[PDB]
Amino acid sequence: SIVNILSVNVLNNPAKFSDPYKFEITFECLEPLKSDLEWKLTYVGSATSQSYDQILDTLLVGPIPIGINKFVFEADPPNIDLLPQLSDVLGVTVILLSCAYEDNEFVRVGYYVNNEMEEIKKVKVDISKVWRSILAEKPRVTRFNIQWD
Amino acid sequence: SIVNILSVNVLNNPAKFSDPYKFEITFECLEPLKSDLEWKLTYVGSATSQSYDQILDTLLVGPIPIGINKFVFEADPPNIDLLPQLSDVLGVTVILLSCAYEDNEFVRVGYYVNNEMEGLNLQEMIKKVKVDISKVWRSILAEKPRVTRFNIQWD
Amino acid sequence: VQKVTITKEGKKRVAPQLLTT
Amino acid sequence: QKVTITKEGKKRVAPQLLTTLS
Numbered sequence: 001s002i003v004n005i006l007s008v009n010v011l012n013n014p015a016k017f018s019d020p021y022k023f024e025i026t027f028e029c030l031e032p033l034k035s036d037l038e039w040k041l042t043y044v045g046s047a048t049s050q051s052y053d054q055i056l057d058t059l060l061v062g063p064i065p066i067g068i069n070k071f072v073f074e075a076d077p078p079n080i081d082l083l084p085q086l087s088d089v090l091g092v093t094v095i096l097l098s099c100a101y102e103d104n105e106f107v108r109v110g111y112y113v114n115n116e117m118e119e120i121k122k123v124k125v126d127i128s129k130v131w132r133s134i135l136a137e138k139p140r141v142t143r144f145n146i147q148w149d
Numbered sequence: 150s151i152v153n154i155l156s157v158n159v160l161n162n163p164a165k166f167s168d169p170y171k172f173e174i175t176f177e178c179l180e181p182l183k184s185d186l187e188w189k190l191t192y193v194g195s196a197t198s199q200s201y202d203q204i205l206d207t208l209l210v211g212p213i214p215i216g217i218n219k220f221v222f223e224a225d226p227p228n229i230d231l232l233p234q235l236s237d238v239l240g241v242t243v244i245l246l247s248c249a250y251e252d253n254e255f256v257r258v259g260y261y262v263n264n265e266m267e268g269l270n271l272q273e274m275i276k277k278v279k280v281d282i283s284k285v286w287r288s289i290l291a292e293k294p295r296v297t298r299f300n301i302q303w304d
Numbered sequence: 305v306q307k308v309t310i311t312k313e314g315k316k317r318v319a320p321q322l323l324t325t
Numbered sequence: 326q327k328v329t330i331t332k333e334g335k336k337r338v339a340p341q342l343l344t345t346l347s
Contacts, residue, residue, distance in 0.1 A: 035313060035314020036313045062313060
């Protein structure tokens with residue numbers, strides 16, 4: 001691997017459900033690259049959910065110096081409209097921070113995220129009252145071999 | 150919307166699991182666009198629950214004149230390194246064709262995919278059988294697309 | 305047959321066939 | 326950090342070179 005992650009720090013944690021994610025990322029690039037890196041952040045629901053993953057945001061980083069690099073990835077929050085069973089934003093979900101070179105993913109940083117809320121009518125989950133907390137000290141990393149240049 | 154899909158035809162269907170996907174897409178553009186369109190193909194697994202979705206490929210299409218436009222998006226097959234349980238390729242999966250303009254998705258076309266392994270050949274008709282991914286076949290149900298539209302700005 | 309190219313950022317890029325306007 | 330936009334309208338960030346030790 002020509003690129004290696006050194007740290008991921010979550011800037012605004014905990015936070016409201018609908019607050020942008022802010023990751024300060026430090027990585028080492030060891031050889032010259034012809035192309036950008038392509039970061040993405042991916043909302044992942046529960047095993048019980050039938051909803052496929054939700055890409056929250058992506059970002060081209062480049063051009064890439066040989067050396068040790070830092071940037072901030074600020075990603076939009078989840079779209080509530082693509083979560084038809086709103087209740088499953090509650091409790092423990094996943095976020096995957098991943099990076100691809102030339103449409104090939106080489107690294108994945110997976111987190112657990114804890115989510116909790118602050119005659120009678122049925123109520124709907126109020127999203128403005130949900131807090132998330134990314135468990136940022138316990139990341140699960142996975143490298144994949146890609147071709148690079 | 151300034152772009153409307155008129156047809157999506159899957160050129161190589163059925164196919165082997167490891168074959169590239171070839172989608173022939175025809176669309177209309179009604180106004181000037183300052184940028185290219187960005188098309189994406191995402192592989193989505195079964196209710197399997199231990200599978201993360203996988204972007205197969207993205208393609209920038211342009212320049213785009215006003216009129217009826219056409220192109221082939223040839224995407225890589227699924228990377229099986231991203232699929233821990235190899236046996237989860239089997240059964241019904243999903244494939245998502247989407248397009249964005251300036252990082253904003255406006256269209257998404259979802260299809261159900263059928264996946265199946267070859268039975269034993271005559272010579273073979275003992276050993277437990279591996280799932281050989283080179284002996285798995287997909288068939289995308291290209292006539293039953295699920296289409297979802299998003300409002301974006303086109304200025 | 306399509307003209308395929310690659311942006312500086314590494315994105316592959318195709319020119320579409322204008323069928324009719 | 327310097328945000329920019331590609332020909333295609335894609336958000337692009339130049340990363341801060343901290344140092345080039347290896």
